[PDB]
């Protein structure tokens, strides 16, 4: 036979099986960091799959064994896209930084297979469409709760068709017209409570929503929101029609969300609701997550008295 | 029971909380499904058929369920969720599901890449049963990209996927037909010309019907030329089915357009073709009648 057998020296039927490497996989996982340290290097969170116990990667589609075509670039493409938060990080050595075609993705070089996957994922202007769906949903929430919010008017600035993927500046998307006056605090982040809405007052409110695409090196969206807010409000090109507002930061690759700005009464709970439900409900994000999944070819195998299980050594609380 | 009951009676008196627990037990039954049965399908179809427009606020719930199922590992549940979409397709819209019916449109355009015939067929079914309710002009995702994606599937040489594909393209060429370009229809004509050799007769009858539908959209001066050259083949059962197709083209686009070419072809000195001409006139006089 024209091939080389590296086990020329033994036979499994006759000699038994003289090694077992099943602890190697376990201890490899414990040394890389655990499944958590391992999947923070991946596109796992941008799939929004609830947890990784269901993951399943595609258990010949057809007899062209002969034809020139050759390697089908699909297994390599899937390995490359899956790992893309690490293969495409930010803190690198040499590499000429370039914005992707119609999106807000930065590459630091040329990884053509990765660029092809990422392009095919955000086709048909999906980046701006996501911006539109998010901002529409927020306007609608305000459209409804005008009553409690003291909001006379809500103004959706007909969008500059490239505000979504311009990363160095800001128009503003939401402008809120009060009834009488809002007394407004100093700026703080969407997850902190202590807010004394006393400093100034206005009828004009602006709200910003900005999309990024994080990577392993930098996916903290809190400091993104803080830094972007300070910069964008204290710059001299951003057309903000009021010195009062907030920016909403969305991380598409890790599906995170936060915000930073000057608040007024009712805003904190209001947008907290709006964010925690738009992240879940919006159909744009759904088309995203679905193209991500179909590019990975990931599937979930998951489908869908207790007190015999309840008094166990497992603690379970009754609220 | 419930299915028999509400199907005979109607759902007039079913009040709020009742209908809620009902819709929810419904969702459960359908996920929990562990057999290949029309039981839960028909249950669902009937129950929403009777809820009519009363169901409204649970479309996030209902779909989210169906979609998570559409993600599953085993084919069967995937196929089931495609089915259930094809049932509730009409009410999906009629409650004005912009985000949600848009969802199902684009997400199924995604799954059009499957390779389990059993799921691919059901996906095609669900897309057809969406396009029936939503006429493509107002579609968020347009058949303008669907059908171009479908044409390279017509070459899939398998009875079930071929059946369902030609069904979907026949729907589109019947009613949509104008969100596509003449050149697209011409390529699809050239692909139909070799569905006429499938081993199943449902496929071949569907193929002939769609030649008819494309007959109104594009003048047959070229499709008829491509049919005569097929008459020159041997082996009888694809000659006979092209002769049916000639009859059909002539019936839709009036017979004076095709009669001179048929008659003139009656002069090529070969047997199979002179008999093809005669058999085609047979079918033609049957189809047009008075």
């Amino acid at each position: 036979v024209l091939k080389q057998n590296p086990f020329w020296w033994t036979h499994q039927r006759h000699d038994g099986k003289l090694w077992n490497l099943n602890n190697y996989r376990t201890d490899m996982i414990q040394a890389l960091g655990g499944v958590e340290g391992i999947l923070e290097h991946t596109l796992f969170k941008g799939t929004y799959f609830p947890t990784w116990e269901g993951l399943f990667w595609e258990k010949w589609k057809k007899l062209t064994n002969a034809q020139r075509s050759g390697l089908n670039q699909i297994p390599n493409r899937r390995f490359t896209l899956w790992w893309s938060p690490t293969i495409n990080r930010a803190n690198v050595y040499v590499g000429f930084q370039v914005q992707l075609d119609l999106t807000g993705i930065f590459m630091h070089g040329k990884i053509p297979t990765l660029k092809i996957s990422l392009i095919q994922i955000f086709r048909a202007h999906l980046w701006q469409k996501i911006h539109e769906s998010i901002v529409m949903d927020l306007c609608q929430v305000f459209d409804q709760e005008l009553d409690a919010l003291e909001i006379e008017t809500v103004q959706k600035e007909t969008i500059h068709p490239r505000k979504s993927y311009k990363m160095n500046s800001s128009c503003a998307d939401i402008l809120l017209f009060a009834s009488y006056k809002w007394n407004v605090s100093r700026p703080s982040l969407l997850a902190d409570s202590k807010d004394v809405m006393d400093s100034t007052t206005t009828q004009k409110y602006w709200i910003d929503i900005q999309l990024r695409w994080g990577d392993y090196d930098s996916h903290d969206i809190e400091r993104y929101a803080r830094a972007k807010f300070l910069d964008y409000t204290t710059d001299n090109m951003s057309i903000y029609p009021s010195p009062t507002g907030v920016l909403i930061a969305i991380d598409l690759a890790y599906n995170l969300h936060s915000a930073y700005g000057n608040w007024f009464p009712g805003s904190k709970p209001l947008i907290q609701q709006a964010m925690a439900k738009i992240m879940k409900a919006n159909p744009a994000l759904y088309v995203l997550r679905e193209r991500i999944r179909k590019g990975l070819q990931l599937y979930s195998s998951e489908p869908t008295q207790n007190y015999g299980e309840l008094f166990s050594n497992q603690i379970i609380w009754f609220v | 029971t419930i299915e028999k009951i509400m199907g005979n009676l109607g759902a007039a008196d079913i009040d709020h909380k009742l209908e809620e627990q009902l819709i929810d037990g419904i969702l459960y039954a359908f996920q929990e499904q562990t057999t290949e049965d029309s039981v839960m399908l028909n249950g669902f179809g009937t129950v929403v058929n009777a809820l009519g427009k009363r169901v409204k606020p649970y479309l996030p719930q209902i779909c989210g369920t169906v979609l998570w199922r559409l993600n599953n590992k085993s084919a069967k549940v995937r196929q089931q969720a495609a089915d259930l979409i094809s049932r509730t397709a009409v009410v999906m819209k009629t409650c004005q599901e912009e985000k949600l019916m848009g969802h199902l449109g684009v997400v199924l355009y995604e799954y059009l890449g499957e390779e389990y015939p059993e799921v691919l067929g059901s996906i095609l079914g669900a897309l057809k049963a969406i396009v029936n309710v939503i006429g493509m002009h107002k579609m968020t995702p347009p058949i303008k990209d669907l059908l171009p994606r479908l044409t390279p599937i017509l070459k899939n040489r398998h009875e079930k996927v071929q059946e369902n594909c030609i069904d979907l393209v026949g729907r589109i060429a019947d009613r949509g037909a104008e969100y596509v370009s003449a050149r697209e229809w011409m390529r699809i004509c050239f692909e139909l010309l070799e569905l006429l050799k499938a081993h199943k007769k449902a496929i071949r009858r569907a193929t002939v019907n769609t030649f008819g539908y494309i007959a109104k959209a594009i003048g047959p001066h070229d499709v008829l030329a491509t049919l005569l050259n097929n008459l020159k083949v041997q082996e009888r059962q694809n000659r006979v089915c092209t002769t049916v197709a000639i009859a059909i083209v002539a019936e839709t686009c009036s017979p004076f357009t095709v009669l001179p070419a048929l008659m003139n072809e009656y002069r090529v000195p070969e047997l199979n073709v002179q008999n093809g001409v005669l058999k085609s006139l047979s079918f033609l006089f049957e189809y047009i009648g008075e």
Partner: peptide
């Protein structure tokens, strides 16, 4: 963006088209 594919749904190279088959 293999422009033969994108516009006409069909690339003559098939599997070997060194560009991205995409009609979007």
């Amino acid at each position: 963006i293999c422009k033969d594919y994108k516009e006409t749904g069909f690339c003559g190279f098939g599997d070997s088209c060194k560009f991205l088959h995409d009609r979007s």
